[PDB]
Design an enzyme around this catalytic site. Structure first.
Site, PDB file in Angstrom:
ATOM      1  N   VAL A 131       0.778  -1.236   0.000  1.00  0.00           N
ATOM      2  CA  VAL A 131       0.000   0.000   0.000  1.00  0.00           C
ATOM      3  C   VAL A 131       0.816   1.297   0.000  1.00  0.00           C
ATOM      4  O   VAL A 131       0.321   2.338  -0.434  1.00  0.00           O
ATOM      5  CB  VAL A 131      -0.978   0.027   1.203  1.00  0.00           C
ATOM      6  N   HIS A 152      12.071  -8.266  -8.647  1.00  0.00           N
ATOM      7  CA  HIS A 152      12.508  -7.340  -7.606  1.00  0.00           C
ATOM      8  C   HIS A 152      13.464  -6.349  -8.267  1.00  0.00           C
ATOM      9  O   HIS A 152      14.429  -6.750  -8.921  1.00  0.00           O
ATOM     10  CB  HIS A 152      13.215  -8.128  -6.500  1.00  0.00           C
ATOM     11  N   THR A 164      18.727 -12.956  -2.390  1.00  0.00           N
ATOM     12  CA  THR A 164      18.563 -13.109  -0.953  1.00  0.00           C
ATOM     13  C   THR A 164      17.491 -14.133  -0.573  1.00  0.00           C
ATOM     14  O   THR A 164      16.634 -13.869   0.271  1.00  0.00           O
ATOM     15  CB  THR A 164      18.249 -11.760  -0.270  1.00  0.00           C
ATOM     16  N   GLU A 222       8.033 -12.990   1.518  1.00  0.00           N
ATOM     17  CA  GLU A 222       8.728 -12.908   0.241  1.00  0.00           C
ATOM     18  C   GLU A 222       9.619 -14.121  -0.005  1.00  0.00           C
ATOM     19  O   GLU A 222       9.763 -14.575  -1.148  1.00  0.00           O
ATOM     20  CB  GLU A 222       9.550 -11.618   0.191  1.00  0.00           C
ATOM     21  N   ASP A 245      11.609   1.896  -7.236  1.00  0.00           N
ATOM     22  CA  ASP A 245      11.874   2.880  -6.191  1.00  0.00           C
ATOM     23  C   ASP A 245      12.847   3.848  -6.853  1.00  0.00           C
ATOM     24  O   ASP A 245      14.055   3.597  -6.898  1.00  0.00           O
ATOM     25  CB  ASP A 245      12.533   2.223  -4.975  1.00  0.00           C
TER      26      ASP A 245
HETATM   27  C1  LIG Z   1      16.498  -0.243   1.091  1.00  0.00           C
HETATM   28  C2  LIG Z   1      16.335  -1.640   1.698  1.00  0.00           C
HETATM   29  O1  LIG Z   1      15.955  -1.747   2.998  1.00  0.00           O
HETATM   30  N1  LIG Z   1      17.085  -2.602   1.164  1.00  0.00           N
HETATM   31  C3  LIG Z   1      17.549  -2.598  -0.232  1.00  0.00           C
HETATM   32  C4  LIG Z   1      17.021  -3.833  -0.968  1.00  0.00           C
HETATM   33  O2  LIG Z   1      15.587  -3.841  -0.994  1.00  0.00           O
HETATM   34  C5  LIG Z   1      15.081  -4.774  -0.027  1.00  0.00           C
HETATM   35  O3  LIG Z   1      15.316  -6.116  -0.492  1.00  0.00           O
HETATM   36  C6  LIG Z   1      14.900  -7.101   0.467  1.00  0.00           C
HETATM   37  C7  LIG Z   1      15.258  -8.499  -0.043  1.00  0.00           C
HETATM   38  O4  LIG Z   1      16.671  -8.585  -0.242  1.00  0.00           O
HETATM   39  C8  LIG Z   1      13.389  -6.984   0.691  1.00  0.00           C
HETATM   40  O5  LIG Z   1      12.698  -7.271  -0.528  1.00  0.00           O
HETATM   41  C9  LIG Z   1      13.054  -5.561   1.146  1.00  0.00           C
HETATM   42  O6  LIG Z   1      11.637  -5.418   1.271  1.00  0.00           O
HETATM   43  C10 LIG Z   1      13.589  -4.533   0.146  1.00  0.00           C
HETATM   44  O7  LIG Z   1      13.385  -3.198   0.636  1.00  0.00           O
HETATM   45  C11 LIG Z   1      12.105  -2.681   0.241  1.00  0.00           C
HETATM   46  O8  LIG Z   1      12.050  -2.533  -1.190  1.00  0.00           O
HETATM   47  C12 LIG Z   1      13.072  -1.657  -1.697  1.00  0.00           C
HETATM   48  C13 LIG Z   1      13.019  -1.627  -3.225  1.00  0.00           C
HETATM   49  C14 LIG Z   1      12.882  -0.246  -1.129  1.00  0.00           C
HETATM   50  O9  LIG Z   1      11.634   0.294  -1.572  1.00  0.00           O
HETATM   51  C15 LIG Z   1      12.903  -0.301   0.400  1.00  0.00           C
HETATM   52  O10 LIG Z   1      12.596   0.991   0.930  1.00  0.00           O
HETATM   53  C16 LIG Z   1      11.880  -1.321   0.908  1.00  0.00           C
HETATM   54  O11 LIG Z   1      11.973  -1.445   2.329  1.00  0.00           O
HETATM   55  C17 LIG Z   1      17.595  -3.871  -2.387  1.00  0.00           C
HETATM   56  O12 LIG Z   1      17.212  -5.095  -3.020  1.00  0.00           O
HETATM   57  C18 LIG Z   1      19.122  -3.769  -2.342  1.00  0.00           C
HETATM   58  C19 LIG Z   1      19.683  -3.742  -3.765  1.00  0.00           C
HETATM   59  O13 LIG Z   1      19.162  -2.610  -4.466  1.00  0.00           O
HETATM   60  O14 LIG Z   1      19.516  -2.571  -1.652  1.00  0.00           O
HETATM   61  C20 LIG Z   1      19.079  -2.564  -0.283  1.00  0.00           C
HETATM   62  O15 LIG Z   1      19.553  -1.384   0.370  1.00  0.00           O
HETATM   63  O1  LIG Z   2      -0.605  -2.976   6.821  1.00  0.00           O
HETATM   64  C1  LIG Z   2       0.395  -3.090   6.115  1.00  0.00           C
HETATM   65  C2  LIG Z   2       1.626  -3.381   6.696  1.00  0.00           C
HETATM   66  C3  LIG Z   2       2.755  -3.488   5.892  1.00  0.00           C
HETATM   67  N1  LIG Z   2       2.668  -3.303   4.505  1.00  0.00           N
HETATM   68  C4  LIG Z   2       3.890  -3.349   3.670  1.00  0.00           C
HETATM   69  O2  LIG Z   2       4.980  -4.051   4.293  1.00  0.00           O
HETATM   70  C5  LIG Z   2       6.205  -3.431   3.858  1.00  0.00           C
HETATM   71  C6  LIG Z   2       6.888  -2.816   5.083  1.00  0.00           C
HETATM   72  O3  LIG Z   2       7.286  -3.828   6.011  1.00  0.00           O
HETATM   73  P1  LIG Z   2       7.788  -3.420   7.486  1.00  0.00           P
HETATM   74  O4  LIG Z   2       8.639  -4.669   8.041  1.00  0.00           O
HETATM   75  O5  LIG Z   2       8.563  -2.159   7.520  1.00  0.00           O
HETATM   76  O6  LIG Z   2       6.464  -3.340   8.397  1.00  0.00           O
HETATM   77  P2  LIG Z   2       5.651  -4.683   8.756  1.00  0.00           P
HETATM   78  O7  LIG Z   2       5.616  -5.663   7.645  1.00  0.00           O
HETATM   79  O8  LIG Z   2       6.339  -5.291  10.077  1.00  0.00           O
HETATM   80  O9  LIG Z   2       4.175  -4.217   9.198  1.00  0.00           O
HETATM   81  C7  LIG Z   2       5.796  -2.316   2.891  1.00  0.00           C
HETATM   82  O10 LIG Z   2       5.638  -2.844   1.572  1.00  0.00           O
HETATM   83  C8  LIG Z   2       4.435  -1.935   3.471  1.00  0.00           C
HETATM   84  O11 LIG Z   2       3.647  -1.269   2.481  1.00  0.00           O
HETATM   85  C9  LIG Z   2       1.428  -3.016   3.916  1.00  0.00           C
HETATM   86  O12 LIG Z   2       1.335  -2.854   2.701  1.00  0.00           O
HETATM   87  N2  LIG Z   2       0.292  -2.909   4.729  1.00  0.00           N
END
Ligand SMILES: CC(=O)N[C@@H]1[C@@H](O[C@@H]2O[C@H](CO)[C@H](O)[C@H](O)[C@H]2O[C@@H]2O[C@@H](C)[C@@H](O)[C@@H](O)[C@@H]2O)[C@H](O)[C@@H](CO)O[C@H]1O
Ligand SMILES: O=c1ccn([C@@H]2O[C@H](COP(=O)(O)OP(=O)(O)O)[C@@H](O)[C@H]2O)c(=O)[nH]1
Ligand SMILES: [Hg+2]
Ligand SMILES: [Hg+2]
Ligand SMILES: [Hg+2]
Ligand SMILES: [Hg+2]
Ligand SMILES: [Hg+2]
Ligand SMILES: [Hg+2]
EC number: 2.4.1.40
Length: 264
Positions: A131, A152, A164, A222, A245
């Site tokens: 969201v 991703h 990952t 995931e 992003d």
């Molecule tokens: C910025 C972040 O916390 N991490 C970056 C990586 O993005 C994350 O990847 C992990 C799995 O390896 C999860 O999917 C995680 O949800 C990802 O972060 C989320 O998605 C990204 C695209 C951002 O929007 C972030 O704010 C969000 O929490 C990323 O894959 C790597 C390589 O680019 O960099 C990490 O810093």
């Molecule tokens: O009610 C919710 C809670 C989480 N997220 C998604 O979960 C990710 C963030 O995860 P984070 O670990 O920071 O919070 P949590 O999953 O513990 O609620 C982002 O894509 C948020 O948009 C969402 O879409 N709706």
């Protein structure tokens, strides 16, 4: 039963002219990888409209996340499945906090309080997304298929070794270094109601097993999604155009459009 398409005038596809020469547009199991330039949306809209397709879009907005709903829904109205029937399903712990967003004809929203069979009778496809996002460009029927995952944005150009995935054999989401097609995002997947429910059921059971064994996958939901899609190949894979992003990754040439992006 699918009725005939009407006469349509569009550019003839060129057999000896590759669609894109910079990216992979089909997987080894013959599932198209959706990139701008690979599809004629007029043909696809015709096909899905003739089927009176209804798309369910599910989102969770718990606690502070309810603040992202207004922008999410408003932009979805401008870019998500415009022209088709859409049913939004907002799961939240704060029903009264859901913003009153104006919807176009043929689109409806249901608020489900949190703290199944319905989907089977209300929609044809289910699309589940994060969201804290906003639509910035077209996200349409080109994504609809029995089961799809999205690349991703942080690993689309990485080797499987760098993915990952959950690497501990004690986890149900375990994937060894010599396995893996792509690294899919937990924030954007979907397919037919039946396939989506099969996926969520498989993941729910796998996570319960992990919990009973005192282990939590490195990237939670995931990690399990990736294990499922490794063993049950998606029928379409969406390019990073569908979940990007720009703040963290900019705007590479390979992406002709940024359709759905993270909100800072
Ligand atoms: C910025 C972040 O916390 N991490 C970056 C990586 O993005 C994350 O990847 C992990 C799995 O390896 C999860 O999917 C995680 O949800 C990802 O972060 C989320 O998605 C990204 C695209 C951002 O929007 C972030 O704010 C969000 O929490 C990323 O894959 C790597 C390589 O680019 O960099 C990490 O810093
Ligand atoms: O009610 C919710 C809670 C989480 N997220 C998604 O979960 C990710 C963030 O995860 P984070 O670990 O920071 O919070 P949590 O999953 O513990 O609620 C982002 O894509 C948020 O948009 C969402 O879409 N709706
Ligand atoms: Hg093409
Ligand atoms: Hg869903
Ligand atoms: Hg989701
Ligand atoms: Hg799973
Ligand atoms: Hg799960
Ligand atoms: Hg899953």
């Amino acid at each position: 039963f699918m009725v005939s398409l009407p006469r349509m005038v569009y550019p003839q596809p060129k057999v000896l002219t590759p669609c894109r020469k910079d990216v992979l547009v089909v997987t080894p199991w013959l599932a198209p990888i959706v990139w701008e330039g690979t599809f004629n949306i007029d043909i696809l809209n015709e096909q899905f409209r003739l089927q009176n397709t209804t798309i369910g879009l599910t989102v969770f907005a718990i606690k502070k996340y309810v603040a992202f709903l207004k922008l999410f829904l408003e932009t979805a109205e401008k870019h998500f499945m415009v022209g088709h029937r859409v049913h939004y399903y907002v799961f939240t712990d704060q029903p009264a906090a859901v913003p009153r967003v104006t919807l176009g004809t043929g689109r409806q929203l249901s608020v489900l309080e949190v703290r199944e069979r319905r989907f089977l009778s209300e929609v044809d496809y289910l699309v589940c997304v994060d969201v804290d996002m906003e639509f910035r460009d077209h996200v349409g029927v080109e994504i609809l298929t029995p089961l799809f995952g999205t690349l991703h944005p942080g690993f689309y150009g990485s080797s499987r070794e760098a993915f990952t995935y959950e690497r501990r054999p004690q986890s149900q989401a375990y994937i060894p270094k010599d396995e893996g097609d792509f690294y899919y995002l937990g924030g954007f997947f979907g397919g037919s109601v039946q396939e989506v429910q099969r996926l969520t059921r498989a993941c729910h059971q796998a996570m319960m097993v992990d919990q009973a064994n005192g282990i939590e996958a490195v990237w939670h939901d995931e990690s399990h999604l990736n294990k499922y899609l490794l063993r049950h190949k998606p029928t379409k894979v969406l390019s990073p155009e569908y979940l990007w992003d720009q703040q963290l990754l900019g705007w590479p040439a390979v992406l002709r459009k940024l359709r759905f992006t993270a909100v800072p």
